[PDB]
RNA sequence: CAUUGGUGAGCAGCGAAGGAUUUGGUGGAUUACUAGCUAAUAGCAAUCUAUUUCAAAGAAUUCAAACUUGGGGGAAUGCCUUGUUGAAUAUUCUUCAAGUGUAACCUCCUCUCAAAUCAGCGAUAUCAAACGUACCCCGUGAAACACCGGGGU
RNA sequence: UGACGGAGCCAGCGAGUCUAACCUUGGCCGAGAGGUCUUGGUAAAAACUCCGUCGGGGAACGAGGAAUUCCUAGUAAGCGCAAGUCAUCAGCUUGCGUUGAUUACGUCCCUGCCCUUUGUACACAC
RNA sequence: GUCGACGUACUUCAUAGGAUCAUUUCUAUAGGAAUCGUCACUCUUUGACUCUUCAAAAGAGCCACUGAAUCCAACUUGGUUGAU
């Protein structure tokens, strides 16, 4: 796993570099809720859920 | 607004169905027989029903024994020997210099039972009549057929040697 | 450069691992050449191959220094760097200068607050053959590594009996001319690795009558190196000693540089083994 | 959205991540104003990208800078680097180009270390 | 091997020193069609000049020097993933 | 406390009988403008036909012609090339033979990657629930510092 | 190149169900091994910035003689933190980061070392 | 010092009986089933075509006129005797 650090080739572009983000320390963050649909409730959904 | 990486449309071979070679595109566990013990085969009782090869007839002539009268000497009980329809199709196919065996094969005490096959080859007509029932008692002297039946459990194989016949997998020898 | 220098390592591996699978084909093409030359019988699995039969019609035209040193071997002079561990004692900072004098083409760069990456990586850039780093215990120098730079091997040496040159007398200063060498008692194939990794630290082709000769002697698994001058009298050669006495012992041999620390270990001195004291070059 | 520009600044082992966005004119370092930098003598070493070009050009922008690594001095060389880079990379993006070449010629004549990292890579003799 | 020269010289050997294969070998684009999509749109370059024919043969020596073309929208997105853009480069 | 994240309520401000986003279709450009048609020194353009023909001119390899073929090996039968047998009076036709002759025809190669995905497996982790430990409370019960259930921190 | 006490903020390597002491008085339980509690003794990021306060040695010793060696930029030097990787070191070793200069960078005059003394290589020039 | 001779030790070498497919009829065998000018419906498989998700990237570019859809502002109608 350290051998892959030596050979990162920092021109690599995979198309899932839009859904993933990265913390400012440098290691990535992944959501607790995981799904694409459990992101954050809209105001119309909260107006019903309250 | 035309798309990128366009390429001339051409014939898939690994995927298309119009090609001849690409046109092509419940378990079964047979129960071991309700007769059979571990190897004992507790159902076979006299009289016996014995299948016969071509080879068992040919070495019966060289060793001067009757079929029916000579089998009862080895077997000590009554037996009904019965040549299948595939085996008689071999005995005719052996030809002119085996015709004295073909006379002795058609004897009204030698029974005949038909089969539903597409073939002459009686070496594999015979084992298939044995797995599906396991009441028969094979009389062969083929080397490859003996090995084909000694792996089958509980089927008394019978061969000819020296003077009289010999049996192998009968527990009730005497 | 950094991407180029990495990818030549990757292809050098795949050119090396190809040879191990083609060493078997290297062996069988000896049999075809000899049996064509003298001898009828031909073995079974080499008989049934039609692949290797057609393959031989090209292969009939084919035919030693180490594979890392192979491109440079006699052509280019080495340029080497003797550098010290970290905040050196004033005894060993003298002793790096005797290593700087024992080789030709050797410069001494004092090390402090360099890292081993940016001293390696700022040396492949400037282009040097290899790197000599020393260590010490309380002024007595103990260890020594030579590490060939263009992804070449390294050899961590332990060196026990040292006598620095500055202890003795103000007898003068060394000859500094290209030395002859003396390699004694190297029989093992690992012993030939230590031959070809030490030998290329000297400038190629010494004169037939240069006057200082550097012996590398291997009695009892401790490579013992001394520095000598010689003159030839009317009957015998008479010699005298200048420069350091070493005992020396390699104990691990990586295929990468001394930067790398996870490279493949060609050899490693096993201490803790039931037959450790028995064998030689083990 | 919000117009921003992110530039880096680097001395010995200290980074400096300066987000520059259009705003009101506040300049923060680590969630603290730039008048409270630690070494207190080198505070005018980070007022250089403020005072070289003129303090008017910070009236519409925000300079959020956060630094890690380094020491006391070698962070001050990182915040003066990322404010100069963060100012001169906002005028080529969201303000006028002729502003940028006025700035890049202003920081150059004063001290080129504001823009490009003076990397003191080793030399063997 | 001297008999690679008759046995291993195949078109699929010479057709994988193509540029879009090399951009898939160096893990630049995800797939091999998608690399043709990035060459044709103009995001890749060899040294100074960008390359626009997809079918550019690339020397093993020249295989070092393929990069994304600078200030591109596809070399900008890569640097946002590592949170390491620097718009003084206007990456 | 920070959002350089999403939704959604408001205000300052900008604000001439409204504003913003998105898109279908046609036109004019995208190089430097001398008109359409035909049988074209002229005629048409409502049409060339009951002048549209004759005359003139016009026939080279005495029958040059795949500059075009993925690479090995073959080519029986073909075809080509040369040699020959036989007939009609040098060519035409016919018969047989031979060619490290072959862009017909047989055969092996021209695929199997210093590759990447999807599926299994599954770690550093995460959310919830139950269960465990201690602690007070409530029901059941006549009652047990309850050896009955439950709630809570 | 001070002494003390607060306050201020700055790193980079490092994470194997593995990381760690001795001696003693005394109680209780236990057939014992031992358990448990008790008791005393002995070992074992900094510089930096800011404020407050201050103005001989306990004989060898007040910054180290002649001589002598190393040393050219993130270098000399100052500072602490870390790990202990089959040799080597724990009386220490090797890493890592912080703050970081002066003086050369010329010349063969000296002391050494070395090379050459057919121009051979092909122009022109010497 | 190496290479023979002998002794020892291991490794290796021969398979056979059938059946089917292979020739633009026919693999050699008569012990084998296939010669038809088609009209519907159901079901399944594959391919385009238009949108399109993981998920972007790039626009043969600019103007003019006419047409449409969405979103507020406005107005009208219904709406606490109950709109969503
Ligand atoms: Zn049958």
From Swiss-Prot, chain A:
It is found in: Nucleus, Nucleolus. It comes from the Eukaryota. Component of the ribosomal small subunit (SSU) processome composed of at least 40 protein subunits and snoRNA U3. Interacts with snoRNA U3. Interacts with EBP2, FAF1, MPP10, RPS16A and RRP14. Involved in nucleolar processing of pre-18S ribosomal RNA. Belongs to the UTP11 family. This is U3 small nucleolar RNA-associated protein 11. The gene is UTP11. The chain holds residues 51 to 100 of 250 of the full protein.
Swiss-Prot record, chain C:
Transmembrane segments: none annotated. Pfam families: Brix. Its main location: nucleus. Disulfide bonds: none annotated. Residues 78-259 form the Brix domain. One of its GO terms (biological process) is maturation of SSU-rRNA. Keywords: Nucleus, Ribonucleoprotein, Ribosome biogenesis, rRNA processing. GO terms for molecular function: RNA folding chaperone; rRNA primary transcript binding; single-stranded telomeric DNA binding; snoRNA binding. It comes from the Eukaryota. It is found in: Nucleus, Nucleolus. GO terms for cellular component: 90S preribosome; Mpp10 complex; nucleolus; nucleoplasm; small-subunit processome. PROSITE patterns: BRIX (PS50833). PANTHER family: U3 SMALL NUCLEOLAR RIBONUCLEOPROTEIN PROTEIN IMP4. Required for the early cleavages at sites A0, A1 and A2 during 18S ribosomal pre-RNA processing. Component of a heterotrimeric complex containing IMP3, IMP4 and MPP10. Interacts with MPP10. Component of the ribosomal small subunit (SSU) processome composed of at least 40 protein subunits and snoRNA U3. This is U3 small nucleolar ribonucleoprotein protein IMP4. It comes from Saccharomyces cerevisiae (strain ATCC 204508 / S288c) (Baker's yeast). The lineage of its organism: Eukaryota, Fungi, Dikarya, Ascomycota, Saccharomycotina.
Curated annotation (Swiss-Prot), chain D:
GO terms for biological process: maturation of SSU-rRNA from tricistronic rRNA transcript (SSU-rRNA, 5.8S rRNA, LSU-rRNA); translational initiation. The modification Phosphoserine is found at residues 32, 59, 74. Pfam families: Ribosomal_S9 (PF00380). There is a cross-link at residues 28, 45, 57 (Glycyl lysine isopeptide (Lys-Gly) (interchain with G-Cter in ubiquitin)). The keyword Ubl conjugation applies. Its main location: cytoplasm. PROSITE patterns: RIBOSOMAL_S9 (PS00360). The modification Phosphothreonine is found at residue 68. Component of the small ribosomal subunit (SSU). Mature yeast ribosomes consist of a small (40S) and a large (60S) subunit. The 40S small subunit contains 1 molecule of ribosomal RNA (18S rRNA) and 33 different proteins (encoded by 57 genes). The large 60S subunit contains 3 rRNA molecules (25S, 5.8S and 5S rRNA) and 46 different proteins (encoded by 81 genes). PANTHER family: RIBOSOMAL PROTEIN S16, RIBOSOMAL PROTEIN S9. This is Small ribosomal subunit protein uS9A. It comes from Saccharomyces cerevisiae (strain ATCC 204508 / S288c).
Swiss-Prot record, chain E:
It comes from the Eukaryota. The keyword Nucleus applies. GO terms for cellular component: 90S preribosome; Mpp10 complex; nucleolus; nucleoplasm; small-subunit processome. It is found in: Nucleus, Nucleolus. GO terms for biological process: maturation of SSU-rRNA; ribosomal small subunit biogenesis; rRNA processing. The keyword Magnesium does not apply. Keywords: Nucleus, Ribonucleoprotein, Ribosome biogenesis, RNA-binding, rRNA processing, rRNA-binding. One of its GO terms (molecular function) is snoRNA binding. Residues 17-83 form the S4 RNA-binding domain. Belongs to the universal ribosomal protein uS4 family. Component of a heterotrimeric complex containing IMP3, IMP4 and MPP10. Interacts with MPP10. Component of the ribosomal small subunit (SSU) processome composed of at least 40 protein subunits and snoRNA U3. Required for the early cleavages at sites A0, A1 and A2 during 18S ribosomal pre-RNA processing. This is U3 small nucleolar ribonucleoprotein protein IMP3. It comes from Saccharomyces cerevisiae (strain ATCC 204508 / S288c) (Baker's yeast). The lineage of its organism: Eukaryota, Fungi, Dikarya, Ascomycota, Saccharomycotina.
């Amino acid at each position: 796993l350290r051998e892959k650090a030596k050979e990162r080739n920092p021109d690599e572009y995979y198309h899932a570099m839009h859904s993933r983000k990265t913390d400012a320390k440098g290691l990535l963050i992944s959501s607790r809720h995981g799904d694409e649909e459990d992101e954050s409730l809209s105001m119309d959904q909260v107006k019903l859920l309250k | 607004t035309r798309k990128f990486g366009l390429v001339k449309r051409t014939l898939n071979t690994k995927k298309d169905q119009r090609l001849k070679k690409n046109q092509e595109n419940t378990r079964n566990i047979p129960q071991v027989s309700s007769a059979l013990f571990f190897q004992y085969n507790q159902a076979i009782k006299p009289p016996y029903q014995v299948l016969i090869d071509t080879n068992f007839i040919n070495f019966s002539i060289q060793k001067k024994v009757d079929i029916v009268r000579g089998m009862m000497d080895c077997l000590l009980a009554k037996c009904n020997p019965l040549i299948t329809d595939c085996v008689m199709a071999e005995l005719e196919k052996l030809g002119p210099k085996y015709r004295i065996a073909l006379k002795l094969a058609r004897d009204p005490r030698i029974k005949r039972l038909s089969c539903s096959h597409k073939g002459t080859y009686a070496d594999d007509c015979l084992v298939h009549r044995v797995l599906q029932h396991k009441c028969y008692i094979v009389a062969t002297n083929d080397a490859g057929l003996k090995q084909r039946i000694r792996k089958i459990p509980g089927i008394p194989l019978m061969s000819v040697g020296g003077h009289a016949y010999v049996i192998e997998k009968l527990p009730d020898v005497f | 450069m950094l991407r180029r220098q990495a990818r030549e390592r990757r292809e050098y591996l795949y050119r090396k691992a190809q040879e191990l699978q083609d060493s078997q084909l290297q062996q069988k093409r000896q049999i075809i050449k000899q049996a064509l030359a003298q001898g009828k019988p031909l073995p079974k699995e080499l008989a049934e191959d039609e692949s290797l039969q057609k393959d031989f019609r090209y292969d009939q035209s084919l035919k030693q220094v180490d594979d890392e040193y192979a491109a440079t071997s006699g052509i280019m002079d080495p340029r080497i760097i003797v550098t010290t561990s970290r905040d050196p004692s004033t005894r060993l900072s003298q002793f790096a200068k005797e290593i700087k004098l024992l080789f030709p083409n050797a410069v001494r760069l004092n090390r402090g607050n360099y890292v081993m990456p940016n001293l390696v990586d700022a040396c492949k850039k400037s282009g040097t053959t290899d790197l000599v780093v020393l260590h010490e215990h309380r002024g007595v120098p103990t260890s020594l590594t030579i590490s060939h730079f263009p992804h070449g091997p390294t050899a961590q040496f332990s060196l026990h009996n040292v006598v620095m040159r500055h202890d003795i007398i103000n007898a003068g200063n060394q000859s500094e001319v290209n030395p002859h060498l003396i390699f004694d008692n190297f029989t093992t194939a690992l012993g030939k690795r230590v031959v070809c990794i030490l030998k290329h630290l000297f400038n190629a082709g010494p004169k037939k009558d240069s006057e200082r000769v550097i012996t590398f002697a291997n009695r009892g698994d401790f490579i013992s190196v001394r520095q000598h001058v010689y003159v030839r009298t009317r009957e015998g050669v008479e010699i005298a000693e200048v420069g350091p006495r070493f005992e020396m012992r390699l104990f691990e041999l990586r295929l990468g540089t001394l930067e790398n620390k996870d490279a493949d270990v060609e050899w490693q001195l096993r201490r803790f083994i039931r037959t450790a004291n028995k064998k030689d070059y083990l | 959205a919000v117009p921003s520009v992110q530039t880096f600044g680097k001395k010995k082992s200290a980074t400096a991540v300066a987000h520059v966005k259009a705003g009101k004119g506040l300049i923060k370092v680590n969630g603290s104003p730039i008048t409270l930098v630690e070494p207190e003598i080198l505070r005018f070493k980070v007022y250089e990208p403020l005072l070289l070009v003129g303090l008017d050009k910070f009236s519409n922008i925000d300079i959020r800078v956060r630094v890690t690594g380094g020491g006391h001095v070698s962070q001050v060389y990182a915040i003066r680097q990322a404010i100069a880079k963060g100012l001169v990379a906002y005028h080529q993006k969201y303000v006028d180009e002729q502003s940028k070449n006025e700035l890049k010629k202003a920081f150059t004549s004063y001290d080129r270390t504001l823009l490009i990292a003076d990397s003191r890579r080793p030399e063997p003799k | 091997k001297i008999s690679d020269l008759e046995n291993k010289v195949t078109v699929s050997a010479i057709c994988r020193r193509r540029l879009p294969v090399i951009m898939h070998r160096l893990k630049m684009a995800e797939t091999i069609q998608d690399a043709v999509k990035f060459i044709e749109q103009g995001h890749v370059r060899v040294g100074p000049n960008l390359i626009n024919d997809p079918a550019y043969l690339v020397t093993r020596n020249m295989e070092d020097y393929v990069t994304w073309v600078d200030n591109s929208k596809i070399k900008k997105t890569l640097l946002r993933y590592r949170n390491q853009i620097d718009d003084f480069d206007f990456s």
